[PDB]
A paper describes a structure:
TGFBI-related corneal dystrophy (CD) is characterized by the accumulation of insoluble protein deposits in the corneal tissues, eventually leading to progressive corneal opacity. Mutations in the TGFBI gene results in the mutant protein product, TGFBI protein (TGFBIp) which is proteolytically cleaved in the corneal tissues. From our previous proteomics analysis and spatial high-resolution mass spectrometry imaging, we concluded that the TGFBIp is the main component of the amyloid aggregates found in patients’cornea and the TGFBIp-derived peptides are the predominant component of the TGFBIp fibril found in the amyloid deposits, respectively. Since the mechanism of amyloid disassembly by ATP-independent chaperones is unknown, we reconstructed atomic models of the amyloids self-assembled from TGFBIp-derived peptides and their complex with L-PGDS using cryo-EM and NMR.
Biophysical study of different mutants of the 611-633 region of the TGFBIp has revealed that the G623R mutant showed the highest amyloid aggregation propensity and fibril stability. Since this 611-633 region with the G623R mutation of the TGFBIp showed the most microscopically homogeneous fibrils and well-resolved ssNMR spectra, we have chosen it as our primary model system for structural studies. We used a hybrid structure determination approach combining ssNMR and cryo-EM to produce the atomic resolution model of the fibril. Next, we obtained an electron density map of the fibrils with 4.9 Å resolution after 3D refinement. Finally, we obtained the atomic model of the G623R fibrils through the combination of the data obtained from both techniques. From the analysis of the G623R fibril model, the R623 residue is involved in the formation of intermolecular salt-bridge with D617 and E615 in the opposite strand. Furthermore, when we simultaneously swapped the residues participating in this salt bridge in the double mutant (R623D, D617R), uniform fibrils could again be produced, thus validating the presence of this salt bridge in the amyloid model. Additionally, this thermodynamically favorable interaction provided by the inter-strand salt bridge likely accelerates the fibril growth of the G623R peptide compared to wild-type and other mutants. We identified the structurally frustrated interactions within the G623R fibril using the online server, Frustratometer40. From Fig. S13a, b the highly frustrated regions within the G623R fibrils, represented by red lines, are clustered around the β-turn region of the fibril. The β-turn region is enriched with negatively charged residues (E615 and D617) stacked upon each other which experiences strong charge-charge repulsion.
Residue numbers in the entry:
A (entry chain P), B (entry chain L), C (entry chain H), D (entry chain D), E (entry chain T), F (entry chain C), ...: 1 to 23
Write the structure that this text describes.
């Protein structure tokens, strides 16, 4: 909820999953 | 309320599912 | 409310799934 | 709902599904 | 969304599903 | 090299290999 | 080499290789 | 070199390979 | 080695490998 | 060469592999 | 400008039962 | 001007029961 | 002018039962 | 400008039962 | 703004049972 | 009695390479 | 007494590579 | 009495590589 | 009496590489 | 009585590489 003077920003959501099963 | 200095913005949602299953 | 400098933007949503098999 | 000068755009939604099987 | 002059545009949603056969 | 009176023994070797695939 | 009197023994070797396929 | 009085005995070797994958 | 009085005995070698994946 | 009275005995080698996935 | 590309559902279901007999 | 692209869907379900008998 | 991107989904459920008997 | 940003979700359930018997 | 921002969440459940009897 | 019963052998080798081109 | 029963053998080697280019 | 039973074996080796470029 | 029972063995080797770039 | 017990073993190797860059 940006409500102030103008500035620089960004919105980039990233998700990653990694796993190594040994059995 | 996404408002700020005129600039470039892109809602690029990156998703990836990786897993090294042995079976 | 995306209001800023008149620019071009396009969503680059990509999805990929990969696994392995061994029996 | 972005607005700008008459420009060109396109939804580059790509989807891929690949796995492996030994049978 | 684009609401400018009637320009050329069309969705290009590509899809591919293939599996490795072995039997 | 088992040697003795006649018996009704017999081998019952069976193999089972199941594998799932979701494509 | 199970040698003995002439009995009625016999081998019952059977193979079973089942695999699931989606296609 | 199994040599002795007669008796009942039969080999019942069985193998099972189970596996599951969630694509 | 088995060279004594008669006694019931038989091999029951069995293998079972279980594995799962949650992705 | 375990020689003695006819006592009950039978070899049975069992193996099991278990893993706890965490993602 | 209501536009939406088509879609197809690739529903699959596999099931079988096997019960031999020696007799 | 409602817009919403579709998504691929595929419900997988495997189940089987096997029971042997020597008689 | 509602907007809402979709999300890939897939229900996974596998189960099996086996009851071996030597008789 | 009502917009929804759902997250990725997928159900996972794997279980197996075995009850051997020599009879 | 009328925009939601849910948190990542996924159901996880892994359990198994094994039994054996010599009889 | 130097004799060995027959037995089927499972051996295969599959390979595939796909590459998209735009030009 | 050179005698040895056969056994099932499963040997495989799968490999695949996918690439993309926009030019 | 040169006798030696066989053993189950299944060698496998899977490998895959994926790359992407927008140019 | 040169006899020696074997043991279960299976060479496992899985590896993958990924290099994502937006350019 | 030349009988030497075996040695249980199981080769396991899991490794992966990832290099994400936005450029």
């Amino acid at each position: 909820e940006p409500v102030a003077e103008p500035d620089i920003m960004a919105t980039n959501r990233v998700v990653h999953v990694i796993t190594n099963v040994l059995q």
